[PDB]
Design an enzyme around this catalytic site. Structure first.
Site, mmCIF file in Angstrom:
data_model
loop_
_atom_site.group_PDB
_atom_site.id
_atom_site.type_symbol
_atom_site.label_atom_id
_atom_site.label_comp_id
_atom_site.label_asym_id
_atom_site.label_seq_id
_atom_site.Cartn_x
_atom_site.Cartn_y
_atom_site.Cartn_z
ATOM 1 N N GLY D 29 0.792 -1.233 0.000
ATOM 2 C CA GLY D 29 0.000 0.000 0.000
ATOM 3 C C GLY D 29 0.821 1.279 0.000
ATOM 4 O O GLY D 29 2.046 1.245 0.118
ATOM 5 N N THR D 30 0.132 2.414 -0.124
ATOM 6 C CA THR D 30 0.785 3.725 -0.163
ATOM 7 C C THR D 30 1.316 4.113 1.214
ATOM 8 O O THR D 30 0.904 3.549 2.228
ATOM 9 C CB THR D 30 -0.164 4.842 -0.657
ATOM 10 O OG1 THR D 30 -1.241 5.019 0.272
ATOM 11 C CG2 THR D 30 -0.726 4.516 -2.041
ATOM 12 N N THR D 31 2.228 5.080 1.242
ATOM 13 C CA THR D 31 2.871 5.493 2.487
ATOM 14 C C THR D 31 1.950 6.388 3.318
ATOM 15 O O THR D 31 1.343 7.324 2.796
ATOM 16 C CB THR D 31 4.195 6.241 2.217
ATOM 17 O OG1 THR D 31 4.994 5.490 1.290
ATOM 18 C CG2 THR D 31 4.983 6.445 3.511
ATOM 19 N N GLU D 46 0.151 9.547 1.575
ATOM 20 C CA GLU D 46 0.433 9.616 0.143
ATOM 21 C C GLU D 46 -0.756 9.067 -0.647
ATOM 22 O O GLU D 46 -1.153 7.917 -0.453
ATOM 23 C CB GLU D 46 1.692 8.796 -0.171
ATOM 24 C CG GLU D 46 2.022 8.633 -1.649
ATOM 25 C CD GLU D 46 3.172 7.670 -1.887
ATOM 26 O OE1 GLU D 46 4.112 8.038 -2.620
ATOM 27 O OE2 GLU D 46 3.145 6.548 -1.340
ATOM 28 N N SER D 74 -2.580 2.136 5.688
ATOM 29 C CA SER D 74 -1.977 1.691 4.435
ATOM 30 C C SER D 74 -2.320 0.225 4.203
ATOM 31 O O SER D 74 -2.287 -0.575 5.137
ATOM 32 C CB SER D 74 -0.458 1.854 4.489
ATOM 33 O OG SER D 74 -0.095 3.214 4.648
#
Ligand SMILES: [Cl-]
Ligand SMILES: [Mg+2]
Ligand SMILES: [Mg+2]
Lengths: 240, 244, 250, 243, 195, 241, 111, 231, 235
Positions: D29-31, D46, D74
């Site tokens: 997943g995204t930060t 993010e 995330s």
């Protein structure tokens, strides 16, 4: 509760559990149904592997569902009791709510529906039983004979057989039974039913059971000696 | 999920047999032989305890023969624990019938009820069947003296003489040979013990390896008496019939 | 969530064997030896207190347990399974008997109730069998003294004397030679200590052995006076000192 | 083998492989990050711009619980939403019975027990999210991070997702260089920088910055989104630092 | 409904039941048959609250008929009466009890004896040589106490029954529109068409 | 081989899932120790904060179950907190129903029974934790009772749990072999804590700072944990003799 | 004791013409001897060229109308935007009222 | 492979294969396009037939006067999810006298779909949805995936060959967003967008399905000769 | 084993796809919609000559304005027909009107996907639902166990379906009469059937606005078969 789907489709479009239930019926003792002009006769095989049996108290193969309808079967014996009980309860339930006894077609449709329900309900297996349901509708003199099977399909038959070696006795009935002129009397109808079982049974002693059902709730079971007289007459004519 | 670990106890084989019922019957074939013989004036129940010990308290022990009510008794072949579950249910059913109709329960009705319970475990619930075969010995005023058997499939049948458990093939042949319709209880007692003595896997048939019972109209006037034999009484009947 | 294991985990194999029961019996075989001997005027049950660590206080772990004032129990196999069975056995003696008949159940019927619980764990959905064999000793007015064994299957048998667990085969042979129908309770205790010494490796004393009796009524242990018919419990657990005294005359 | 096919099964190691596989979804997943400041907490995330067709500032990822707790995560976004819905039920029943708003440590355990419960049975799947959350209560500021196993601890700074290593390194510098502490407005600036620095791990697609904060002085202890001039000021500070 | 009588003679049981059905101030029917055949040799008459009576009787009938088919055997009058009593005793502690009183007249083919059972809505069962429900007994029992013998013929039983109805017709303020009489014996159940 | 996935018997009569739950117990790599004084019960545990980003005040494996009962856990924190919450609920329910404070040994038994159920019922997994309950019981005095994933429990004179439990166990065994008593003959709990720390140092062979340890103390009518500064005072007294 | 019913007064009138229909009603709402509102609409356009008024206990009247308006909406969803005929609406309303046979909507309804 | 037997099982790389297989059903489905301006929002759907004797499967479903969607994948699952939206839109009106926000409608669909991805026995939904609507914050377009992921967009497309229409909208972004107060021109842009996903077949009178909602425009569906204007 | 509601890698429900294979094994059923009515015809397929063929009920009335033909595991259809009849009459109770054919079909199809681990498996039968209403006129629908239903001008289901459907492709036009449709069903049934078509092993039915749903007598069908033979021999 136990919800596991036991009856399911296979890649080739078959429900194996329903088909294996038919194999249990194939293993069961032979049962035959023949309808005459004014009667229906239900014949049943008794395997002679079991002697020292008490024939007074042993569960009979033909069962009364009501005073005017009877039910015989082929397959698992224990499974048949559950269908018979349900059918008997429904017969009284119908009299109680509609004030008429069940028609033979209605009773058959109910039993067939119970069998069908056990092919798409969770946590249960199909009944390993095929039935022959016979009788006369209230205030009607036209004979009725139906067949059911584990899948839940049902249909009416001029004459039919189920169980082990049913292929052979059906072969006999197909060539011997004439639709244009069916067994006119009780004698002719019983004789044809005994003849058909003699193709498969082995000995004509205590291996053949016969039950005659006539209109207006007139149901009787033939005794050993009465059946033995048919067995004697058939073979004496055959020696020619 | 949980499906992974399900054995599926209530399914047909490709040949149309119930796996678990067949395997339960295989279990029962290793159990001690139980025999029932019906006569004109009574019924005999004879059964063999399995490889006992000298330190087993026999006079207070019960693994084969059980009392359902005053008129009906059963001989057990298979898992004893499973049998006791069913026996207690049958005892309750007999009392329910008595409370409802104010009459003792007919033998067949009790047998059908227990057999229906066994049937249920083969068709629904996902549980293993009861690994038990019964011989029912009983009396009522409709059919008189009656012998029945039920097995894990829930199928039951009536008999003049019958065996369950180990060596039933051999035992049934011996019973079929010597049994006659005009037979009496004292003769049936002798037949039952003689059959066990020939079919047994033990070296010799002794009192401590047996359970025995009779249902007789040999009670004072028109009534029925159940007799569960004591160890000393089994020892006496073994000497009387000429086995020991 | 929901318990979705509504199906049996114990099933018949092609040979007719119930695998989980057999495997439960194997667990019992690995367990520490325990035994029971019936005398004319009493019953004795005994076992080894196999301490898991010397820092552990083995007095707090009770292998021999009171079920009713006149009934006691000991086991071989899995300890935690035994502990919960004792809890259930104590409760069922009240719910299914004492609250109905106003008196404690006879030994055979309490055994029957325990046996039922163990049978159900062999057939019900989503459970394994209990991994223990129980020896239940007791007394009641009409049946006198009695001793029963209960297995993982739920089967139970009455014994004059027996042993279960690690060295049961040897112990049962030892008991067959020594047992007779004229034994007094003190003679049975003596035989119990002799039999148990053969299966024990290390220390053999009152602190490493657990032993209880079903014998005479103990009015000193009743806790109250004034009711003649109430004469006290027949179950008594022997103290560490009481065991050591009988080990000198061994 | 076969120990990894079913949830709640211990391997011979003593590990629950299904929970470890859920962590892989989190790492994919995204930060997202969290920074504890003097009198509150700052959350940042993010948001990958997959396409120009995405409406800016509309697909909001950070979620509020009650009025004083912020949650960001995330991994599998739906799993995070499910966890926040539960969190809101837990916070509501607490306030219903006890009157006071749920304390952060109390709230942390409510989520922890619920996530842990999804490692007890094979009939459920573990959560595919690591959740960073916190806020201000009667005892001050609290920042927490919660993993798929149900494990959670208190943090000075927290980071998860694909760019977690880069973020953690940046968070560790702030802890060392500011032992006396960091202000709320500073933490917002630093949060922007860290997300921008962590974006090097997701450098293929361009992204959108989203920040929220709870502070006793700046927001009266309530959770609020950083908007307008304060957001742009943080973006400018972040863009200046990467160049 | 109102009046139901019963008498057990030497070789049969005779049940007499009124024909009237009232709704409001109007007699809707004067030919109502307040009875159901439970089995070939067992008859049950009934009286009580409107609607409940027939529903209960037909429910009992269905259960006994179900038993007969299942076992291929007729239950004894004693067994049937006990089943009926239990259903009423079960009913009295229900949320809404069935307010029905019954007489069960049967011929036991095993013992070759007629049997009459009186059961009220509470589940109070008694075996009697003659019986009634409600106020019917207040007028008739004195005649029955006087004239009844156990060796009476069916014809003598009918004559004594006529006398009971005549006394009811004289001293009751209620017009019950005569009675339908049915006889239960070894040959089964039949109705006396002229009474 | 599905007998290794759920809690059913293997052919050897073993429960592999229970055995693997025991192995999860050492996943934290933390060692705990419990001892009894005259008037008190002390429990110490290693504290390891590897990440600098962690708030060290929230890192703990010691729990206050009730006013009188304390619990230290050996195993992963999620299962530890699961057990802690349940024990708190059980202790409170007990007081409400039976009108007195739940004893340490009774709570231990209750939690041990719950653990037994997970070893018998298939749908529930065992918790990968070992629970050490401590108190000064009003009837039994200083008490240490420890539960494991098998559902086993027993009282202790002293005990140790963790990867290096054996080294600590033998160290304690040797001390009680000398003194020939079932406890630490000391008046103040402060000196009993000093004993506990000293003997862990000797057994493990490592020195401890104030942040390396975690201490719980049970006295009559209360259980409490020590702060870092309270532990520092304890470490100073050890070094000065 | 709590009385779940009340009387809000008002009067309504429906007349059917040859190719038209009217449904009229006063706008006064009351309890006992007080006026609640001099203008509180009581006759509503329910869509599909049907008008409706539930006179009596206003709370039950508002609830019924609200449910019928809802029934019209779902009739469109379930049956391909078919127009609900006046006879079909009437039969539908019967079933809405009888669903509370044992705790009635205290209103006299006209469409 | 070994981890795709049910929805309750993660793969070793943290993937949920049953959800991915449900996503695959959408790609097999017929193309549908969604786009909006500041005043209006438009759905355009290519309907699919079984054969020449058969009718063309309906793609667009109305949820309220101000909201509706288009489907791609298992049609029965769309009926279940649209029914749920109808109820939720309706609950908001009856209880709060409030038209349901399009954003909140997306959140509700996300949560309903999510429950089916985490529990044993059930299955994920096998359909993708494009929700359009007009509420208090203007026009809206949402894309729903049965993984649970819901996304607010200016324009998009789902189904077979949907990448062509999605690229077109990505170029036309600045143009079609400005089409305010002109429903016919916004539909034209949608019809031109869906045309980029066509191969072999072209837009006929009983093939094309269009829906629109806006400021003073209730959600209305156009089929048959009503869309001949745009062919 | 595997879940009952499991998706295949191609994005299809295994069980639904397997139930379609069972329907392919079923006896042939054909439906043709015209502006004068909709015709429904079926192959009876008796397994033996002793089986009384008139008891084979593969064409069924749902309401006066709606009929139904089936193919596949015909026992599974009974509960579907029961639901359809209940839905049709219940709507008449609530709304004092006939129910739309599409709405009736949708109600039947809502049962389809109610299976899992509700019923344990999908239905193994397909239905041709034919009827008439005032809004959309004469209609023919094909209801599958997937829960999907397509409207058709003409449709064949069962074992000879793809061969019959190709024939219906060429023959059907919008100006067909009822008599022409009747002969067309008989023609195509005779083509795909194993045994020789007659009045005993094949059945016809229709639905018209005036007379409603009617199953044809064996005497009436026999004449239409004789009329077919003569017109085929005419060229
Ligand atoms: Cl407990
Ligand atoms: Mg009375
Ligand atoms: Mg478990």
């Amino acid at each position: 509760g136990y919800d596991r789907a036991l009856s399911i489709f296979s890649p080739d479009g078959h429900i194996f559990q329903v088909e294996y239930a038919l194999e249990a019926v194939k293993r069961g003792t032979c049962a035959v149904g023949v309808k005459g002009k004014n009667c229906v006769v239900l014949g049943c095989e008794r395997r002679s592997t079991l002697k020292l049996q008490d024939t007074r108290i042993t569960p009979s193969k033909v069962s009364k569902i009501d005073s005017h309808v009877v039910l015989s079967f082929s397959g698992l014996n224990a499974d048949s009791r559950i269908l018979i009980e349900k059918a008997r309860v429904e017969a009284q339930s119908h009299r109680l709510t509609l004030e008429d006894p069940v028609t033979v077609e209605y009773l058959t449709r109910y039993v067939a529906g119970v069998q069908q329900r056990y092919t798409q309900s969770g946590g249960v297996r199909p009944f390993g039983v095929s039935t022959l349901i016979a009788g006369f509708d209230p205030r009607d003199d036209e004979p009725k004979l139906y067949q059911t099977e584990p899948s839940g399909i049902y249909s009416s038959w001029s004459a039919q057989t189920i169980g082990r070696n049913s292929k052979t006795v059906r072969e006999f009935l197909e060539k011997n039974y004439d639709r244009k002129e069916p067994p006119a009397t009780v004698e002719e109808c019983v004789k044809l039913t005994v003849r058909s079982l003699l193709e498969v049974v082995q000995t004509g002693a205590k291996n053949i059971e016969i039950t005659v059902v006539k209109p207006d709730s007139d149901i009787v079971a033939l005794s050993s000696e009465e059946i033995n007289q048919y067995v004697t007459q058939i073979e004496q004519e055959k020696q020619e | 999920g949980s499906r992974r670990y399900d054995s599926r106890t209530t399914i047909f084989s490709p040949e149309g047999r119930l796996y678990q019922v067949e395997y339960a019957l295989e279990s029962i074939s290793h159990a001690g032989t139980a025999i029932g013989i019906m006569a004109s004036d009574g019924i005999v129940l004879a059964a063999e305890r399995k490889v006992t010990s000298t330190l087993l308290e026999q006079d207070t022990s019960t693994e084969k023969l059980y009392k359902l009510n005053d008129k009906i008794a059963v001989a057990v072949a298979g898992l004893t624990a499973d049998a006791e579950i069913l026996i207690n249910t049958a005892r309750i059913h007999a009392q329910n019938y008595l409370k409802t109709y104010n009459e003792d329960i007919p033998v067949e009705i009790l047998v059908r009820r227990l057999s229906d319970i066994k049937q249920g475990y083969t068709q629904h619930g996902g549980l293993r069947p009861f690994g038990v075969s019964f011989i029912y010995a009983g009396y009522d005023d409709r059919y008189g003296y009656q012998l029945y058997t039920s097995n894990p499939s829930g199928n039951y049948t009536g008999w003049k003489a019958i065996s369950v458990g180990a060596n039933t093939s051999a035992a049934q042949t011996l019973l079929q040979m010597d049994y006659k319709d005009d037979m009496k209880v004292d003769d049936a007692i002798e037949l039952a013990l003689k059959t066990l003595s020939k079919t047994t896997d033990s070296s010799a048939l002794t009192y401590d390896r047996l359970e025995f019972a009779t249902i007789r109209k040999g009670a004072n006037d028109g009534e029925v008496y159940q007799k569960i034999f004591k160890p000393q009484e089994i020892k006496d009947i073994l000497v009387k019939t000429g086995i020991t | 969530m929901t318990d979705r294991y509504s199906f049996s985990l114990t099933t018949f194999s092609p040979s007719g064997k119930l695998g989980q029961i057999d495997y439960a019996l194997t667990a019992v075989k690995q367990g520490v030896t325990s035994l029971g001997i019936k005398a004319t005027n009493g019953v004795v049950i005994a076992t080894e207190k196999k301490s898991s660590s010397p820092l552990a206080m083995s007095e707090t772990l009770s292998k021999v347990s009171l079920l009713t004032p006149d009934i006691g129990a000991v086991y071989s196999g899995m300890g935690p399974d035994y502990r919960v069975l004792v809890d259930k056995s104590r409760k069922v003696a009240h719910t299914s008997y004492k609250r109905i008949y106003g008196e404690y159940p006879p030994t055979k019927l309490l055994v029957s109730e325990v046996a039922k619980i163990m049978q159900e764990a062999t057939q019900s959905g989503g459970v394994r069998p209990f991994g223990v064999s129980l020896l239940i000793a007791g007394h009641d007015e009409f049946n006198g003294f009695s001793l029963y064994q209960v297995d993982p299957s739920g089967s139970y048998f009455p014994w004059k004397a027996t042993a279960i667990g690690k060295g049961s085969v040897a112990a049962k042979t030892f008991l067959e030679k020594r047992w007779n129908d004229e034994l007094e309770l003190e003679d049975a205790i003596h035989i119990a200590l002799l039999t148990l010494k053969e299966s024990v490796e290390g220390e053999f004393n009152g602190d490493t052995i657990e032993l209880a009796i079903i014998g005479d009524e103990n009015p000193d242990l009743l806790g109250y006076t004034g009711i003649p018919t109430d004469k006290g419990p027949r179950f008594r657990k022997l103290t560490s000192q009481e065991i050591n005294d009988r080990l000198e005359a061994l | 083998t076969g120990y990894d096919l079913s949830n709640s099964v211990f391997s011979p190691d003593g590990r629950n492989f299904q929970v470890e596989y859920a962590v892989k979804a989190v790492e994919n997943g995204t930060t997202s990050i969290g920074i504890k400041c003097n009198d509150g907490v700052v959350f940042a995330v993010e948001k990958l711009i997959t396409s120009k067709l995405l409406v800016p500032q509309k697909n909001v990822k950070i979620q509020v619980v009650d009025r004083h707790i912020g949650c960001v995560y995330s991994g599998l976004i739906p799993d995070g939403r499910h966890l926040v819905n539960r969190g809101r039920e837990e916070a509501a029943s607490f306030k219903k019975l006890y009157k006071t708003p749920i304390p952060i440590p109390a709230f942390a355990d409510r989520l922890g027990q619920y996530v842990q419960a999804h490692t007890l049975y094979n009939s459920v799947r573990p959560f595919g999210v690591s959740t960073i959350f916190g806020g201000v209560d009667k005892n001050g500021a609290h920042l927490y991070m919660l993993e798929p196993s149900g494990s959670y601890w208190g943090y000075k700074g927290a980071a998860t997702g694909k760019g977690r290593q880069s973020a953690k390194a940046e968070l560790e510098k702030l802890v060392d260089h500011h032992p006396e502490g960091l202000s709320a407005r500073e933490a917002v600036k630093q949060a922007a920088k860290i997300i921008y620095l962590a974006h090097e791990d997701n450098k293929e697609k361009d992204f959108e910055l989203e920040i929220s904060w709870c502070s006793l002085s700046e927001t009266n202890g309530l959770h609020k989104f950083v908007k307008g001039d304060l957001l742009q000021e943080a973006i400018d500070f972040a863009q200046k630092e990467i160049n | 409904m109102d009046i139901i009588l019963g008498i057990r003679v030497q070789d049969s049981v005779i049940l007499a039941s009124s024909k009237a059905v009232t709704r409001g101030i109007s007699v809707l029917k004067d030919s109502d048959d307040k009875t159901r055949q439970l089995s070939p040799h067992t008859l049950m008459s009934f009286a009580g609250e409107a609607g409940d009576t027939v529903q209960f009787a037909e429910y009992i009938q269905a259960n006994i008929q179900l038993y007969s088919i299942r076992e291929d055997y007729e239950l004894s009058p004693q067994a049937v009466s006990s089943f009926v009593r239990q259903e009423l005793a079960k009913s009295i502690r229900s949320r809404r009890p069935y307010q029905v009183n019954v007489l069960i007249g049967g011929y036991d083919k095993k013992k070759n004896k007629p049997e009459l059972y009186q059961i009220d809505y509470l589940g109070t069962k008694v075996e009697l040589p003659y019986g009634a429900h409600g106020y019917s007994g207040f007028y008739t029992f004195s005649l029955l106490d006087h004239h009844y013998r156990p060796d009476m013929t069916t014809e003598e039983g009918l004559d004594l029954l006529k006398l009971c109805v005549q006394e009811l017709e004289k001293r009751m303020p209620m017009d019950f529109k005569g009675v339908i009489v049915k006889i239960v014996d070894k040959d089964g159940i039949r109705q006396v068409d002229d009474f | 081989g599905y007998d290794r996935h759920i809690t059913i018997f293997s052919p050897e009569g073993r429960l592999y899932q229970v055995e693997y739950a025991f192995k999860a117990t050492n996943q934290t790599n933390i060692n705990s120790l419990a001892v009894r004084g005259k008037d008190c019960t002390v429990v110490i545990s290693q504290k390891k904060v590897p990440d600098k980003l962690l708030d060290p005040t929230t890192v703990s494996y010691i729990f206050c179950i009730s006013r009188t009962i304390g619990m230290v856990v050996n195993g992963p924190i999620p299962d530890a907190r699961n057990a802690a919450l349940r024990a708190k609920a059980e202790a409170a329910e007990f007081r409400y129903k039976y009108g007195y404070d739940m004893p340490c040994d009774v709570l231990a038994k209750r939690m041990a029974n719950l653990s037994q159920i997970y070893t018998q019922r298939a749908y529930m997994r065992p918790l990968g934790v070992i629970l050490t309950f401590v108190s000064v019981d009003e009837e039994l005095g200083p008490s240490i009772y420890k539960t494991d994933p098998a559902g086993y429990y027993v009282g202790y004179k002293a005990t140790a749990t963790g990867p290096k439990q054996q080294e600590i166990t033998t160290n304690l065994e040797n001390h009680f072999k000398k003194s020939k008593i079932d406890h630490i003959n000391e008046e103040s709990w402060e000196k009993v804590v000093e004993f506990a720390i000293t003997h862990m140092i000797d057994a493990l062979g490592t020195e401890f700072s104030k942040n390396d340890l975690e201490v719980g103390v049970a006295t009559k009518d209360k259980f409490f944990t020590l702060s870092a500064e309270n532990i520092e005072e304890r470490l100073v007294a050890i070094a000065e003799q | 004791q709590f009385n779940p019913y009340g009387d809000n007064g008002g009067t309504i009138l429906g007349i059917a013409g040859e190719d038209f229909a009217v449904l009229a009603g006063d706008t006064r709402n009351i309890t006992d001897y007080s006026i609640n509102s001099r203008y509180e609409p009581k006759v509503f356009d329910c869509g599909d060229n049907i008008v409706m008024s539930a006179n009596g206990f206003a709370a039950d009247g508002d609830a019924l109308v609200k449910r019928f308006k809802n029934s019209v909406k779902w009739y469109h969803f379930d049956h391909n935007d078919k127009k609900l005929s006046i006879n079909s609406a009437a039969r539908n309303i019967q079933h809405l009222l009888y669903s509370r046979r044992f705790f009635p909507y205290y209103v006299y309804n006209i469409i | 492979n070994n981890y795709d037997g049910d929805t309750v099982t993660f793969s070793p790389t943290g993937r949920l294969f049953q959800v991915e297989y449900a996503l695959e059903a959408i790609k097999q489905g017929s193309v549908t396009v969604g786009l909006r301006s500041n005043t209006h929002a438009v759905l355009v759907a290519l309907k699919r037939n079984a054969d020449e004797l058969s009718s063309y499967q309906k793609k667009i479903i109305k949820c309220d006067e101000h909201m509706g969607l288009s489907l791609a994948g298992l049609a029965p699952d769309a009926r279940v999810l649209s029914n749920y939206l109808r109820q939720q839109c309706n609950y908001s009106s009856l209880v709060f006298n409030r038209k349901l926000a399009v954003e909140r409608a997306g959140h509700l669909l996300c949560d309903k779909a999510q429950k089916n991805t985490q529990s044993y026995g059930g299955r994920p939904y096998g359909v993708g949805l494009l929700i359009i609507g007009y509420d208090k914050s203007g026009a809206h377009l949402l894309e729903f995936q049965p993984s649970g992921n819901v996304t607010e967009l200016y324009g998009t497309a789902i189904g077979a060959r949907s990448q062509g229409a999605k690229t077109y909208l990505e170029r036309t972004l600045d143009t079609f967003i400005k089409i305010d107060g002109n429903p016919d021109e916004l539909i034209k842009a949608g019809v031109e967008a869906i045309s980029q996903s066509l191969r072999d077949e072209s837009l006929t009178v009983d093939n094309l399905s269009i829906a629109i909602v806006g400021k003073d425009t209730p959600f209305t569906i156009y089929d048959g000769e009503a869309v001949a204007k745009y062919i | 084993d595997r879940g009952v509601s499991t998706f295949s890698p191609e994005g299809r429900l295994f069980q639904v796809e397997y139930s379609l294979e069972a329907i392919k094994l079923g006896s042939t059923a054909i439906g043709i919609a015209t502006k004068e009515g909709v015709v429904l015809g079926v192959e009876k397929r008796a397994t033996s000559p002793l089986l009384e063929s008139d008891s084979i009920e593969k064409i069924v009335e749902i309401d006066r304005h709606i009929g139904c033909a089936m193919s596949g595991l015909t026992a599974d259809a009974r509960s579907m027909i029961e639901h359809a009849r209940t839905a049709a009459v219940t709507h008449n109770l609530y709304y004092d009107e006939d129910i739309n054919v599409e709405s009736l079909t949708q109600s039947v199809c809502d049962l389809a996907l109610r299976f899992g681990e509700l019923m344990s498996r999908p239905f193994g039968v397909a239905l041709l639902i034919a009827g008439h209403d005032a809004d959309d006129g004469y209609q023919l629908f094909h209801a599958e166990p997937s829960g999907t239903f397509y409207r058709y001008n003409a449709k064949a289901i069962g074992s000879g379906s793809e061969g019959a459907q190709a024939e219906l492709l060429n023959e059907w036009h919008s100006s067909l009469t009822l008599k022409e449709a009747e002969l067309l069903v008989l023609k195509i049934l005779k083509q795909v059937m194993e045994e020789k078509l007659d009045e005993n092993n094949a059945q016809l039915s229709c639905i018209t606005k005036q007379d409603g749903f009617k199953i044809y007598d064996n005497e009436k069908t026999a004449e239409l078969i004789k009329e077919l033979k003569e017109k085929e021999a005419a060229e």
